[PDB]
Ligand binder design. Sequence first.
Ligand SMILES: *[C@@H]1O[C@H](CO)[C@@H](O[C@@H]2O[C@H](CO)[C@@H](O[C@@H]3O[C@H](CO)[C@@H](O[C@@H]4O[C@H](CO)[C@@H](O)[C@H](O)[C@H]4NC(C)=O)[C@H](O)[C@H]3NC(C)=O)[C@H](O)[C@H]2NC(C)=O)[C@H](O)[C@H]1NC(C)=O
Ligand SMILES: *[P@@](=O)(CCC)O[C@H](CNC(=O)OC)c1ccccc1
Length: 317
Amino acid sequence: LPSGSDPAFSQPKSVLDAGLTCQGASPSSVSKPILLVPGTGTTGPQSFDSNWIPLSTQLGYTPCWISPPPFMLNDTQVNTEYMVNAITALYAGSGNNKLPVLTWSQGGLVAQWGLTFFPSIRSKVDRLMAFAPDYKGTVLAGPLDALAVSAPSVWQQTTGSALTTALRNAGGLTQIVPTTNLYSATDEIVQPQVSNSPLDSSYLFNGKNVQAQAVCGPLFVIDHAGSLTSQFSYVVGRSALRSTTGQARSADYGITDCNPLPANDLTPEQKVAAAALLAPAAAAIVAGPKQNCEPDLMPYARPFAVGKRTCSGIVTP
Ligand SMILES: *[C@@H]1O[C@H](CO)[C@@H](O[C@@H]2O[C@H](CO)[C@@H](O[C@@H]3O[C@H](CO)[C@@H](O[C@@H]4O[C@H](CO)[C@@H](O)[C@H](O)[C@H]4NC(C)=O)[C@H](O)[C@H]3NC(C)=O)[C@H](O)[C@H]2NC(C)=O)[C@H](O)[C@H]1NC(C)=O
Ligand SMILES: *[P@@](=O)(CCC)O[C@H](CNC(=O)OC)c1ccccc1
């Protein structure tokens, strides 16, 4: 696991600041914040307006979020700059108190990439609650790659990419703070997720890894977006956030909670917005940036992916 100084940011601090927003407060003075890291093809509110912004609010938190531009489709290492910066600021703003981080899709990969290469945030993040995280990427992004219609972060979220490699070799597939990964076998965007084991993209050694089907049965279907928004996901999430140990606890959920509909505590209009979560994401991708190769690793991660190919060619130390 890398240690010492954080890598320097490629982006200006002011620009980063501008991707960070809190509900009814300023990052430098916020009571009991939670940072929400959005999925690919979305802003923070597109990801979370229908779900954990209002749910975390009911749980006594002040939701904050980042919106890396454009819709999390740029370089994943840059999207992490926004997250490191936000934690730095939210930890200060809440009276130097650690804070939870909760994420969807790439959000998890960003969180974990951050924790892995930016040691200063390991003592500022309380815990991590990732829904459908792709720490190994997805094999289903290949077609888009073969077609050259893949944004920078889709290249990085491809299985066997330079980025997912770099993460793994640096110690990144082992949990770094108490982590809870809630995923679905039926996920139509991230795969492989079927084997309920370290083969799965959402798995982390020593994490609380929860494949919904392994608790709810093989006919429990929730999709990539349902992984975030279902009543079952809520009950797991609530467990994770309230947990004395930082990880969701089996004592806290079970078969009575296997409800794949949208979280009960949401208003009817949020339940409708919730079910359409995937729409603007699919949109963003389709008319977003496109290239025919993977973004280069930053210097801080090139040591951990020697022999992979990025846009500038073979990576060497
Ligand atoms: C999407 O991602 C791409 C790929 O990461 C990203 O492109 C990279 O952008 C950065 C910044 O735009 C460029 O690199 C470095 O930028 C820093 C940023 O501040 C510069 O350092 C500043 O220099 C000025 C003037 O000399 C100085 O006053 C200031 O003190 C410096 N600022 C800070 C904060 O230190 C560097 O000059 C520059 N370094 C080099 C070696 O070029 C990258 O070069 C870009 N990489 C590529 C491949 O284009 C892009 O910004 C992202 N876009 C969005 C919208 O998020
Ligand atoms: P994540 O950020 C993992 C990225 C591979 O997921 C997005 C969100 N998906 C939906 O909302 O449903 C369409 C993704 C990935 C590939 C294609 C579309 C969307």
